[PDB]
């Protein structure tokens, strides 16, 4: 089976630079049996270039492919505000056709740190019988944070879940919500409800607390 | 200019059958060359292919899936159905129809082909949990006086099935810096999310907070009061 | 499989010869039967292929003066050579083509030993025997070597022992060259130790079997 | 007339690394391509069918990948045994035009060592008649490439030297080599001083090894 | 002017041979080219001749049976004996006629160096070696003579040399009859002192070449 | 059909004298003749064309005249070097009648001189298989000519001899020469006593050289 | 070229007997190449044999010729008074074509002693500044003779003249004379002027002399 | 019966030229295997042949002597002209132009060919010296009695030039013993001879002697008159 690598994994690049995209197959095969398509934020992907030099039809010259044997890139000149999506590259070489992992092209910025805020569960939650508390990081860039919660300052593993929101049309910051769940047996079991959150835009880890009891 | 859609069940249950038709307009599977392709993408996962049928009934299958995976093909109503036995909770994705050509020029020299227009997608789930409702825990701005007018506060929906739910904060009059974050797989099969507004502590008491969430299959629309709660 | 040739030997230019490929376990008229020859010290070429329905083909080089038959009777393959040149001397292969369990196509999957064909006028004769002595010092770390000179012969392949095979560590005997007057020559060295020159006494022996020549010529260091 | 190269023309390798050898056609032959494994005084062997498909018998360390023109065989762990010469053979341009590479040899790796460097004159009997042998042996180095050249009271003597080389020990994988002028007496009795010059990567510097034709 | 030989031997009587003379320095097609025989004893016989423009003609003995061609690509001029008869045993030389400076018109300016065709059905074997001793006398005046007889040989030459060349002065050797059945011999004698029949041991030894016989017989007085 | 003869069949010659070959032709043929020279072991060189052209590299020394049917080749001073056979060829008849003539030869004269008559038995290792040879030996005559008989019991024994003669040689210049006869087993181990006569002109009488099957 | 050589030089054969002449040649011709002319005393020669056996016209059959290889003979069987004279052969075998040295046939007599006689010069020959004194030997057979001037009694060599005529037709013997040529510091400087003759007619030389002062 | 006759200058000068014309009678330049030919005989030497001219124009010359001899025919006037260069002394001779014929006999077999009917001869000679008349001396009967009447007496033609002197004893009257020997080369190229008659020494005082002599070229008409000198 032919695997197509991309590279890099991510990419960050402000409008009016060059944009660098490089796909290397496992197999040698043909230079007109890869394609490069274009997926934007929950959108389906669009062709963008076929037989990995030749241009689909309607995209601005600002998109060029250029492969030999099993090395191939894409370049774009003149990258947009409105030209930040996930890169794919495909084969039809032989079966079954592959994509690749892609490659998510990121609006850069000047470097900030998240605001990090705790909210606690509410009465009807606890009364649920399980409780929840929400640790939310927001305004950070680039997209790589950490989060640890801590129980009575003891560290938390695998009892929390994570989700991270995508890129804003404004600020190109991120944000993001890590849940603490537990039933009423570890919710009144101790007193100290913590996040330490390692950010890049964080000389230091920020260790941040409450207490059910005293609120 | 040529539009596929893809239609059929989006709530599929464990170890069965699924059966999706897309129906495709501006072109019929009658050219030489004409294929329709069926792909997938796993939620956060990269592009797989599934399946090719081609204008003359040759159809193509991914080794690995080829067992479990039928494709067939109505010119006549210009649709494409695949069937997909012996479901998993992995095969949990969105679907997409696509047209694929190729492009020969006067001497059949083959300068490449593709995968174009795809359709819309349809997201389809595998799981056993039937539907269930929201539950809306709303999510306090801390106990804070001014910290320069910074302050963000919530509703957490827990507990729901399936996909989607749709939160707005005050119908619309409140839309500056609302995250809704994408739900998370419980444990359990289970879907679970947080809508946030951004918000100055300089107007806790005075600017309502409520959010409208929605969910068409469980029929929720519940209108949860956020307010500031004190120790 | 087993593939097994015969008919090699030396001719002169111009001359006739015919190879014989005896099969066993498949059967030379229902497969793809092929002669491909390697020349000494060069890579395989493609010479001849047989069809199993007795269509033949043939490389440039040799076609009119090459012919291949098969034989149904005792399964073999027959290669009829005529007009020989000095460009056909080689080993010639015996191979089935497009075989093989996954059915290889158009590859060799099994194979004879080959002959060896020549094509000289040399005048079949004996090698002459010249020994070497190193230079006349006393120690110079403990390293000597002795030779034997084995000169214009034809052909291959000639015997070289060192005391009748006595001797048989640090002998390095060198492949034979082929001298522009379409004679062989080559040199059988070894290393000893100068201490062991003089109580050791070394004779080269030099059996060529074609010429019938076996001659034993001592070695020993000289006096300048 | 498909032109079918090999590259590297040899390679030395250990024993248990992956090696990869590559072979290339003047055109695109899809997939028609074939390795072959042909150890010394012995007839080749097919290894691999279509550039990808591994025959039955041959060991799973055999790998082949590749189609169009260019196309690679890799070995994973290369045993002890392994050590041959691999040819890649073409059967897409027609009945008559199964051409095949130049073939690519296999060795063992070792550490360089210098030979010794010896020269033995043409003695006395040989020249009796008039036909003189003189001889540049090079023993036990490593690796293959060296340069011999010929000496004459600073004269070079070019055009006529025979070069014969030993393939690599079982014991030490090291190389021998002997370098052979061939004269008529006067082409020998005439001149004085007759020297080899030789040079080696495992040697810092070009060594020469002289001899007189007076003294002995 | 040089007009190289090639393609003599020996043949059995109705059989064929070709010979072949390469030129230098002229060309072949160029020139008047005649091929001349002469018998070994007896005088030259001209055998065949092609002309510039390709004409040709022979002797009247072997009309039909011989025929001349010629190679312009590598400037040889060829001789096909077919049917081949004891009489045309001979040395054949490749000729230029009508050259020279002073142009020789009708006349052989350039030679070839000749090659030996020999016909007959003498089975090819090998010569015995046998003693000749001088009468049982003293001194008789200081001279006897002692002998080597070659006996039922084909073909020449051989090689006949006493004490392996260690005696060369006063050697006679005569050449070789052909004998009524078909094989040769010769006698090869020499004289020596009778004082030095005793102190000097004699041996014959006898290389005949194409048999490989290399037979070495003791020479000494008999005892009467 | 013009047949050819050359006189004298041969003639010995000192060294820096005249010497005169004749060659005479059934029928006249203008000047259409041409003298050739072939020295033992070699080829015929072109001497003579035309009957009285001298050759381009052909020493002064020859010269050629005659025409019609007679023709004279004529050497002023014999060098040593000027012994061969030679050789007059017409070139008048038709291309397919160039005949040779019969041959000149010219060797060494010096003093006449004895040979040593020798005869030689049929040894037991030969006679073992009922082939005899008997030989009569003559050693260092001068000249060529002699004449040589089988005596048995006083009978004349003909009709199987055979004779070979040694050509000059370069030392002497004499000849030697041996007369064998071959017989089966019982053409000689019935008879007696076995001779041979000689006669040559540097010899007064014929010698008689008698040997005894019985005695030895 | 061809050389003829006749034989023999001189020839003498009194009429009525056999007169034998020999031609031959250096080269090798064919018999037909080669004629026999005749010239008498101060005549044009004239055609005598032709193709060496063929008598020419007019020529009576006393002339025969006789030719082989490069021997060449002319036979006269009865020769008369008028058939002396000089007889070439001559070749048309190769250019030039050459004749023979000739070869005179003599008038044969009885052996005669010759009459020597001297005369001075006239008074007008002393006047010349030139002085030549004559000495003639008349009637003699044959032609050979020998005559030594000596000025007194001293041999004399290259300062004399000789002059032989034809044969007689009458008696077939033969005369001489040679002169003496001197100048006046010569003829004035002596006394003896002689003639010494050997002839083979003479058993002995005769010397005979004059002085001018005694006449 | 056929004549030639050869004209021309009998007296040429050294290192000139000379023009010699034969004229023939009885036979034409055009018949088949004639020629004309010139031949030369030095005074007291054997012949030489010179040239030879053919019907058909083609012309023969000594090879030692071709480089200066030319020779041309006129057939209409029926002379041939030979022109010979680059005269020396020694190329005094008298010169014939002869007829040159074979005889071949209907079947072409060549019975020989000759020189027949040579013309009379003209005697060139070549020399610097011009003409001279020649000196008389006459030569006295020495002082004997009656010796048996035998005696000679003479007269000396001496430096004269050129060739013939015709010397007459008595008018006629006197021939009985007149030896005129051949005239020889004097060393510059002169020539000179002596005219003798024998008679007896017993008519001495009688009978008288003279000797007219006679050269045209010189025009020397001299009776000299001989008589008996004593002492």
């Known amino acids: 089976?032919?695997?197509?690598?991309?590279?890099?994994?991510?990419?960050?690049?402000?409008?009016?630079?060059?944009?660098?995209?490089?796909?290397?197959?496992?197999?040698?095969?043909?230079?007109?049996?890869?394609?490069?398509?274009?997926?934007?934020?929950?959108?389906?992907?669009?062709?963008?270039?076929?037989?990995?030099?030749?241009?689909?039809?309607?995209?601005?010259?600002?998109?060029?492919?250029?492969?030999?044997?099993?090395?191939?890139?894409?370049?774009?000149?003149?990258?947009?505000?409105?030209?930040?999506?996930?890169?794919?590259?495909?084969?039809?070489?032989?079966?079954?056709?592959?994509?690749?992992?892609?490659?998510?092209?990121?609006?850069?910025?000047?470097?900030?740190?998240?605001?990090?805020?705790?909210?606690?569960?509410?009465?009807?939650?606890?009364?649920?019988?399980?409780?929840?508390?929400?640790?939310?990081?927001?305004?950070?860039?680039?997209?790589?944070?950490?989060?640890?919660?801590?129980?009575?300052?003891?560290?938390?593993?695998?009892?929390?879940?994570?989700?991270?929101?995508?890129?804003?049309?404004?600020?190109?910051?991120?944000?993001?919500?890590?849940?603490?769940?537990?039933?009423?047996?570890?919710?009144?079991?101790?007193?100290?409800?913590?996040?330490?959150?390692?950010?890049?835009?964080?000389?230091?880890?920020?260790?941040?607390?409450?207490?059910?009891?005293?609120? | 200019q040529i539009t596929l859609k893809e239609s059929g069940p989006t709530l599929v249950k464990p170890t069965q059958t699924l059966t999706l038709t897309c129906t495709f307009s501006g072109f019929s599977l009658s050219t030489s060359g004409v294929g329709v392709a069926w792909i997938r993408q796993p939620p956060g996962k990269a592009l797989e292919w599934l399946a090719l049928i081609y204008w003359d009934n040759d159809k193509r299958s991914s080794p690995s899936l080829n067992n479990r995976l039928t494709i067939t093909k109505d010119t006549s109503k210009n649709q494409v159905v695949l069937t997909m036995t012996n479901m998993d909770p992995e095969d949990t994705a969105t679907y997409y129809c696509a047209h694929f050509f190729s492009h020969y020029d006067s001497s059949n020299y083959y300068y490449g082909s593709w995968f174009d227009p795809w359709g819309q997608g349809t997201l389809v789930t595998v799981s056993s949990a039937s539907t269930k409702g929201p539950s809306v825990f709303p999510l306090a701005p801390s106990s804070k006086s001014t910290s320069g007018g910074t302050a963000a506060l919530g509703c957490l929906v827990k507990d729901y099935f399936p996909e989607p739910v749709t939160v707005s904060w005050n119908s619309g009059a409140l839309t500056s810096g609302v995250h809704t974050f994408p739900a998370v797989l419980q444990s359990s099969g289970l879907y679970s999310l947080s809508s946030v507004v951004t918000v100055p502590s300089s107007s806790l008491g005075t600017q309502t907070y409520i959010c409208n969430v929605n969910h068409k299959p469980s029929n929720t629309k519940v209108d949860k009061r956020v307010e500031p709660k004190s120790c | 499989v087993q593939l097994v040739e015969s008919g090699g030997g030396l001719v002169q230019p111009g001359g006739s010869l015919r190879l014989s490929c005896?099969?066993?376990?498949?059967?030379?008229?229902?497969?793809?039967?092929?002669?491909v020859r390697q020349a000494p010290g060069k890579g395989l070429e493609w010479?001849?292929?047989?069809?199993?329905?007795?269509?033949?083909?043939?490389?440039d080089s040799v076609k009119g003066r090459f012919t291949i038959s098969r034989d149904n009777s005792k399964n073999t393959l027959y290669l009829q050579m005529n007009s020989l040149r000095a460009e056909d001397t080689a080993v010639?292969?015996?191979?089935?083509?497009?075989?093989?369990?996954?059915?290889?196509?158009?590859?060799?999957?099994?194979?004879?030993?080959g002959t060896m064909v020549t094509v000289s006028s040399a005048s079949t004769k004996g090698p002459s025997v010249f020994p070497l002595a190193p230079s006349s010092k006393s120690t110079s770390g403990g390293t000597a070597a002795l030779g034997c000179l084995v000169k214009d012969y034809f052909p291959e392949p000639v015997t070289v022992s060192w005391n009748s095979g006595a001797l048989t560590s640090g002998v390095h005997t060198f492949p034979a060259v082929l001298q522009s007057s379409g004679l062989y020559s080559l040199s059988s060295v070894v290393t000893v130790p100068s201490s062991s020159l003089g109580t050791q006494t070394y004779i080269c022996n030099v059996n060529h079997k074609p010429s019938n020549t076996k001659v034993d010529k001592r070695v020993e260091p000289k006096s300048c | 007339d498909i032109q079918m190269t090999q590259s590297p023309s040899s390679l030395s390798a250990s024993v248990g690394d992956r090696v990869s050898i590559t072979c290339?056609?003047?055109?695109?032959?899809?997939?028609?391509?074939?390795?072959y494994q042909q150890k010394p005084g012995k007839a080749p062997k097919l290894?691999?069918?279509?550039?990808?498909?591994?025959?039955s018998g041959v060991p799973s360390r055999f790998s082949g990948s590749g189609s169009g023109t260019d196309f690679t065989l890799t070995i994973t762990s290369l045993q002890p045994e392994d050590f041959a010469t691999?040819?890649?053979?073409?059967?897409?341009?027609?009945?008559?035009?199964?051409?095949?590479?130049?073939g690519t040899k296999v060795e063992i790796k070792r550490t360089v060592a210098a030979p010794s460097v010896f020269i033995f004159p043409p003695s006395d009997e040989q020249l009796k008649s008039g036909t003189a042998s003189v001889v540049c042996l090079l023993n036990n180095f490593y690796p293959r490439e060296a340069k011999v050249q010929w000496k004459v009271d600073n004269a070079l003597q070019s055009g006529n030297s025979q070069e014969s080389v030993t393939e690599q020990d079982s014991k030490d994988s090291t190389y021998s080599l002997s370098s052979t002028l061939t004269l008529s007496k006067a082409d020998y009795e005439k001149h004085k001083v007759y020297a080899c010059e030789v040079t080696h990567q495992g040697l810092s510097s070009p060594v020469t090894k002289s001899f007189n034709r007076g003294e002995c | 002017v040089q007009l190289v030989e090639s393609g003599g031997g020996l043949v059995q009587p109705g059989g064929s041979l070709r010979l072949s003379c390469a030129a230098s320095?002229?060309?072949?097609?160029?020139?008047?080219m005649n091929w001349v025989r002469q018998a070994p004893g007896k005088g030259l016989e001209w055998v065949s001749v092609?002309?510039?423009?390709?004409?040709?003609f022979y002797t009247d003995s072997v009309k039909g049976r011989f025929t001349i061609s010629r190679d312009n690509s590598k400037n040889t001029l060829y001789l096909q004996m077919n049917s081949l008869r004891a009489e045309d045993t001979a040395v054949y030389y490749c000729?230029?006629?009508?050259?020279?400076?002073?142009?020789?018109?009708?006349?052989?300016?350039?030679w070839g160096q000749g090659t030996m065709v020999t016909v007959s059905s003498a089975s090819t074997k090998g010569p015995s070696v046998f003693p000749l001793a001088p009468s049982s006398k003293s001194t008789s005046g200081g001279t006897a003579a002692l002998g080597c007889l070659v006996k039922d040989y084909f073909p020449e030459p051989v090689t006949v040399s006493w004490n392996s060349g260690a005696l060369t002065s006063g050697v006679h050797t005569f050449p070789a009859v052909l004998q009524s059945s078909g094989l040769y011999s010769l006698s090869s004698v020499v004289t020596v002192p009778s004082s030095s029949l005793g102190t000097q041991t004699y041996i014959c030894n006898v290389n005949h070449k194409p048999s490989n016989t290399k037979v070495d017989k003791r020479v000494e007085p008999k005892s009467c | 059909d013009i047949q050819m003869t050359q006189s004298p069949s041969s003639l010995s010659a000192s060294v820096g004298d005249r010497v005169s070959i004749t060659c005479r032709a059934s029928?006249?043929?203008?000047?259409?003749l041409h003298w050739y020279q072939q020295k033992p072991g070699k080829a015929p060189k072109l001497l003579i064309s035309?009957?009285?052209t001298l050759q381009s590299g052909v020493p002064s020394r020859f010269s050629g005249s005659g025409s019609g049917t007679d023709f004279t080749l004529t050497i002023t001073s014999l060098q040593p070097e000027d012994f061969a056979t030679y050789y007059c060829?017409?070139?008048?008849?038709?291309?397919?009648?160039?005949?040779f003539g019969g041959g000149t030869k010219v060797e060494i004269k010096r003093t006449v001189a004895a040979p040593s008559v020798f005869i030689f038995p049929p040894s037991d290792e030969q006679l073992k298989s009922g082939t005899a040879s008997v030989v009569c030996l003559l050693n260092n005559f001068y000249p060529r000519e002699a004449k040589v008989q089988w005596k048995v019991d006083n009978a004349l024994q003909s009709g199987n001899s055979q004779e070979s003669v040694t050509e000059q040689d370069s030392k002497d210049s004499t000849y030697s020469l041996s007369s064998t006869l071959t017989l089966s087993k019982a053409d000689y181990e019935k008879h007696k006593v076995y001779a041979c006569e000689v006669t040559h002109q540097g010899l007064s009488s014929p010698v008689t050289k008698s040997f005894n099957r019985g005695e030895c | 070229?061809?050389?003829?050589?006749?034989?023999?030089?001189?020839?003498?054969?009194?009429?009525?007997?056999?007169?034998?002449?020999?031609?031959?040649?250096?080269?090798?011709?064919?018999?037909?190449?080669?004629?026999?002319?005749?010239?008498?005393?101060?005549?044009?020669?004239?055609?005598?044999?032709?193709?060496?056996?063929?008598?020419?016209?007019?020529?009576?059959?006393?002339?025969?010729?006789?030719?082989?290889?490069?021997?060449?003979?002319?036979?006269?069987?009865?020769?008369?008074?008028?058939?002396?004279?000089?007889?070439?052969?001559?070749?048309?075998?190769?250019?030039?074509?050459?004749?023979?040295?000739?070869?005179?046939?003599?008038?044969?007599?009885?052996?005669?002693?010759?009459?020597?006689?001297?005369?001075?010069?006239?008074?007008?020959?002393?006047?010349?500044?030139?002085?030549?004194?004559?000495?003639?030997?008349?009637?003699?057979?044959?032609?050979?003779?020998?005559?030594?001037?000596?000025?007194?009694?001293?041999?004399?060599?290259?300062?004399?003249?000789?002059?032989?005529?034809?044969?007689?037709?009458?008696?077939?013997?033969?005369?001489?004379?040679?002169?003496?040529?001197?100048?006046?510091?010569?003829?004035?400087?002596?006394?003896?002027?002689?003639?010494?003759?050997?002839?083979?007619?003479?058993?002995?030389?005769?010397?005979?002399?004059?002085?001018?002062?005694?006449? | 019966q056929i004549t030639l006759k050869e004209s021309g200058p009998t007296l040429v000068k050294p290192t000139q030229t000379l023009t010699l014309t034969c004229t023939f009678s009885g036979f034409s330049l055009s018949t088949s295997g004639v020629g004309v030919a010139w031949i030369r005989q030095p005074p007291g030497k054997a012949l030489e042949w010179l040239a030879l001219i053919y019907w058909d124009n083609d012309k023969r010359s000594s090879p030692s002597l071709n480089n200066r001899l030319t020779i041309t025919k006129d057939t209409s006037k029926n002379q041939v002209v030979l022109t010979m260069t680059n005269m020396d002394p020694e190329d005094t001779a008298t010169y014939y132009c002869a007829h040159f014929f074979s005889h071949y006999d209907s079947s072409n077999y060549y019975y020989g060919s000759w020189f027949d009917p040579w013309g009379q001869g003209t005697l060139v000679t070549v020399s610097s010296a011009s003409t001279k008349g020649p000196s008389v001396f006459p030569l006295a009967p020495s002082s004997k009695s009656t010796s048996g009447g035998t005696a000679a007496l003479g007269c000396l033609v001496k430096d004269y030039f050129p060739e013939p002197v015709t010397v007459s004893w008595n008018s006629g009257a006197l021939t009985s013993g007149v030896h005129t020997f051949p005239a020889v080369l004097q060393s510059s190229g002169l020539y000179s001879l002596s005219s003798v008659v024998t008679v007896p020494s017993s008519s001495l005082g009688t009978q008288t002697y003279i000797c007219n002599v006679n050269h045209k070229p010189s025009n020397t008409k001299v009776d000299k008159r001989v008589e008996p000198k004593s002492c």
């Open positions: 000729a230029r006629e009508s050259g020279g400076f002073p142009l020789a018109e009708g006349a052989f300016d350039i």
């Open positions: 320095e002229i060309t072949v097609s160029s020139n008047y």
């Open positions: 092609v002309y510039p423009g390709g004409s040709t």
């Open positions: 029928q006249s043929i203008s000047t259409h």
């Open positions: 035309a009957a009285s």
């Open positions: 060829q017409q070139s008048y008849s038709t291309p397919r009648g160039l005949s």
